[PDB]
Design a protein around this ligand. Structure first.
Ligand SMILES: [Mg+2]
Ligand SMILES: [Mg+2]
Ligand SMILES: [Mg+2]
Ligand SMILES: [Mg+2]
Ligand SMILES: [Mg+2]
Ligand SMILES: [Mg+2]
Ligand SMILES: [Mg+2]
Ligand SMILES: [Mg+2]
Ligand SMILES: [Mg+2]
Ligand SMILES: [Mg+2]
Lengths: 138, 145, 178, 261
RNA sequence: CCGGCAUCGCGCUCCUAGCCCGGCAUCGUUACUUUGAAGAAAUUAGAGUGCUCAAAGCAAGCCAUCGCUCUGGAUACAUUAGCAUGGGAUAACAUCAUAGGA
RNA sequence: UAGGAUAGGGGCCUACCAUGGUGGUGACGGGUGACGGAGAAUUAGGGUUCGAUUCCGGAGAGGGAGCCUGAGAAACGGCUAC
RNA sequence: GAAACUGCGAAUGGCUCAUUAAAUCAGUUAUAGUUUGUUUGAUGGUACGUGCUACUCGGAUAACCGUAGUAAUUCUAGAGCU
């Protein structure tokens, strides 16, 4: 059972200190490996498109998910970013600047796309939203 | 005498030993008499300091140091230095989240006048003075074995 | 330069102490004066904090010395340094500091003690009732000099002042000079 | 910092100046003088703020360069001069005289006095001791040093000082049974009568005081300033005769005064 | 709710000391609790006030809205540590069998 | 212990002497994408996280180091050297 | 009155948060362990006369005027004044 002594404050406080490391969220935020990730603790990052690849969807689905492999400017890492909309892959060209964000779920893959946790949100300084909705052109 | 054991003759400041017209009742430290003082704050000058032969510049009762500041009470923890002790203060620190306590301690160096005798683990009362060495800022005033 | 801060020191635990600051001018020290005992007197002023002055004496020759039991203070010369309780090499270098032991010409004291018609003798006779002059001083006198201790800080006030040894102190330094 | 500070930012100014927090970035920063600059009231506030004799910084300077304002008997042209407790501010051009006294809320007020009660002040002695050539002199708590005092005046007592002759004319012996006005802490402004003094060897002495309307309180020695001998005080009191009251008492005061209007 | 006593209440010279009389100080310490002092402002809470409301701000309101009147610019919270005050249940630590007791 | 130095206490530094001092009540070391505080966000209560930034305190002026002037600077909208 | 000598100030303010984890810092102390231009109040004999009421007046520098150097700078030399 729990220690209950009046003079037990050290035991309780040190015990909580030790046991908090068993919690995945605490350990994820207090261990430092987020600075080793592609974005290095950033919401967005700019990159240069290296190639367009295209990835299959997992078993219950069947489709080709069209993604662009990007190189991050700040650190030179290489990632794959989904291009969200119908026909927006044709806006992407080779060696153009692109603004990438997370997919949601904070670094964990979304939906049926295997091993992709990044999404393309801007190309050539112009939104994919404005290009898909014809508000602006590049 | 017993005091003069160092490479220079040790004497109290401002007492003229080789006086001409001496006396036994003028005042402490007048006409050659050994100087002593009462520290104040309700402490009593030990007799061994009164009729003592030791010479200690740092003694509260016969030296030049004044006692002012805080008056801590603790237990002696170490008496293996020359005329200096380490005392332990034991206290309870409150841990607010858990609404409980824990035992903490602090080691305070304090100068011990030769007029006292301390074993290990005697109750000591120390009073604050000016820095006497790198770590010492307190002086022993009472020792209860 | 030379500094008086605690930063370079190790903690009482023995742990090393990181530098969180540069050296401040209110923390300075200077190099010592090691006042030599020589004829060509030189005392050189120092501008110190508050706009004030200290007198660094580089070389002194004369001094002011008090003879306590006789209650007289006279200017005299310093002949040598014979014992220093801190470092002997100070003695070998004839360096004046506080609490050094020096020999003193003692003639101005002798001529004061030569003193002490009708009304003059009715006062010499008033004195000599309490003449003691313990033999230890008398022997030194016949030698010509007195052993004396410096009671001032030559590198601080630019002076060499002191007293002649008497009683317990005199005999202690005598047995140490043996 | 590598030296003395010369600006006082407005949020750091004393709270009893009642300076508004958006009225600029700086506050007057009282110059050195006979009061401790945290318990003073500079001339800029006396003229511009309270008396509304001037509307701006420079108007106060235009007033002072003309030698109108007189502080304790001399003309002080310094603009941040630290006037303090029990000083007299006099404008002969308007023939008007003020004694600086506290109100119960702990803020300085200019209490108008007559010309008779403006040639004198009271001053509490910091200490008495000897000086060069054995001459005794006493220290006040506002800088004044007087030589050859009455050999009875001891520390913490009060003295009456005529501004004309600049010497003592009377004194009050600090002791139990005298009226005192508190000059520090939360009780500043409250007058009372010394009922008890308890010594503590090595710490501050504490005083226990009882108001004329019965309310009992306490302070420490340094914050007590005797006014008069016996229950009668020697100087005038402000709008409230130094009597603190609860918030409910003044709520009653406002609503009761709201029926006659 | 509490003061002031009395039962089978270890004392006082010295401070306070009623008209022989309460309510005196050192010859075990703490934690705990009560009250007080001293605690920067800004922020927070909160009293007052019709910036036209509000977020605000520290103002303003009356005069015959005529040679000026009344003014305000409160109050509170502030864990731990340090200072002082009463309590002595609860719990620590020290300790009357060598009577070296009063 | 005695000195020297300092505006002054002090191993601050020198000479001599003793063998100490801190540590599971966490010393010493390491990380900090760490200036501290007043404070901020969310708050049933208890809490969790944040505090580069206008107020207070500290520190620095490319990196170290040394200085003059002066009451006050180890100053950088001063100097000297690397 | 410009210029110039003299004096004063430029050590405050402003910016930033790199270094720094009993350090800074906060509440709380201490200086009987010190410095403090300035403000404010008080205060001040003898300098030589063998203490017998005071005992004599300097040169030299800017602004100016004028001869230059150097590619150059609130870089700089020499001469005439006061
Ligand atoms: Mg989880
Ligand atoms: Mg600054
Ligand atoms: Mg000012
Ligand atoms: Mg020393
Ligand atoms: Mg950092
Ligand atoms: Mg940063
Ligand atoms: Mg700042
Ligand atoms: Mg700096
Ligand atoms: Mg830069
Ligand atoms: Mg520098």
């Amino acid at each position: 059972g729990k220690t209950r002594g009046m003079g037990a404050g050290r035991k309780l406080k040190t015990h909580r200190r030790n046991q908090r490391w068993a919690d995945k969220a605490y350990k994820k935020s207090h261990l430092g490996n987020e600075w080793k990730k592609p974005f290095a603790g950033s919401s967005h990052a700019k990159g240069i498109v290296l190639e367009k690849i295209g990835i299959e969807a997992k078993q219950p689905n069947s489709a080709i998910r069209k993604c662009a492999r990007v190189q991050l400017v700040k650190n030179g890492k290489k990632i794959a970013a989904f291009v969200p909309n119908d026909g927006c892959l044709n806006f992407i060209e080779e060696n153009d600047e692109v603004l990438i964000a997370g997919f949601g779920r904070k670094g964990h893959a979304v939906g049926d796309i295997p091993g992709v946790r990044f999404k393309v949100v801007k190309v050539s300084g112009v939104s994919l939203l404005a290009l898909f909705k014809e508000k602006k052109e590049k | 005498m017993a005091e003069q054991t160092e490479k220079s003759f040790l004497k109290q400041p401002k007492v003229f030993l080789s006086t001409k017209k001496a006396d036994k009742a003028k005042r402490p430290g007048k006409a050659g008499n050994r100087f002593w003082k009462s520290v104040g704050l309700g402490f009593k000058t030990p007799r061994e300091a009164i009729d003592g032969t030791y010479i200690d510049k740092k003694c509260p009762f016969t030296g030049t140091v004044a006692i002012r500041g805080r008056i801590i009470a603790g237990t002696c923890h170490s008496a293996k230095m020359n005329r200096t002790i380490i005392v332990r203060r034991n206290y309870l620190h409150f841990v607010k989240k858990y609404q409980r306590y824990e035992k903490r301690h602090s080691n305070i160096p304090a100068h011990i006048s030769p007029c006292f005798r301390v074993k290990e683990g005697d109750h000591v009362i120390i009073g604050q003075c000016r820095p006497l060495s790198k770590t010492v800022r307190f002086n022993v005033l009472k020792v209860v074995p | 330069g030379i500094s008086r801060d605690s930063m370079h020191k190790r903690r009482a635990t023995g742990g090393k102490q990181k530098a969180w600051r540069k050296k401040r001018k209110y923390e300075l020290g200077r190099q010592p004066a090691n006042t030599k005992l020589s004829s060509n007197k030189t005392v050189r002023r120092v501008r110190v904090r508050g706009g004030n002055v200290k007198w660094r004496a580089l070389r002194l020759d004369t001094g002011n010395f008090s003879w306590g039991s006789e209650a007289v203070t006279r200017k005299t010369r310093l002949l040598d340094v014979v014992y220093n309780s801190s470092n002997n090499e100070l003695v070998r270098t004839q360096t004046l500091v506080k609490n050094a032991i020096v020999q003193v010409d003692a003639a101005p004291f002798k001529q004061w003690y030569l003193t002490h018609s009708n009304n003059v003798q009715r006062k010499l006779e008033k004195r000599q009732q309490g003449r003691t002059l313990d033999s230890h001083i008398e022997e030194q006198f016949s030698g010509g000099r007195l052993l004396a201790c410096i009671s001032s800080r030559p590198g601080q006030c630019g002076r060499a002042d002191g007293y002649i040894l008497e009683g317990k102190e005199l005999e202690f330094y005598m047995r140490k000079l043996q | 910092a590598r030296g003395l500070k010369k600006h006082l930012k407005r949020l750091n100014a004393p709270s009893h100046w009642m300076l508004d927090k958006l009225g600029g970035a700086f506050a007057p920063k009282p110059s050195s003088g006979p009061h401790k600059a945290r318990e003073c009231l500079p001339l800029i506030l006396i003229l511009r703020n309270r008396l509304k004799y001037a509307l701006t910084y420079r108007e106060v300077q235009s007033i002072l360069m003309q030698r109108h304002i007189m502080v304790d008997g001399k003309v002080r042209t310094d603009k941040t001069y630290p006037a303090g407790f029990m000083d007299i501010i006099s404008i002969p051009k308007t023939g008007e005289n003020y004694r600086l006294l506290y109100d119960t809320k702990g803020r300085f007020r200019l209490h108008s006095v007559r010309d008779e009660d403006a040639k004198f002040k009271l001053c509490k002695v910091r200490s008495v001791q000897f000086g060069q050539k054995g001459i005794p002199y006493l220290n006040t708590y506002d800088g004044r040093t007087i030589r050859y005092p009455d050999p009875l005046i001891k520390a913490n007592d009060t003295i009456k000082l005529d501004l004309e002759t600049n010497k003592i004319v009377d004194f009050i012996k600090f002791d139990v049974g005298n009226v005192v006005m508190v000059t520090g802490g939360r009780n500043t402004g409250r007058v009372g009568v010394i009922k008890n003094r308890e010594k503590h060897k090595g710490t501050f002495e504490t005083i226990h005081v009882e108001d004329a309307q019965g309310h009992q309180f306490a302070t420490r020695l340094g914050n007590v300033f005797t006014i008069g001998k016996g229950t009668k005080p020697w100087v005038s009191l402000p709008k409230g005769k130094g009597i603190k009251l609860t918030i409910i008492e003044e709520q009653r005061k406002r609503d009761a005064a709201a029926q006659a209007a």
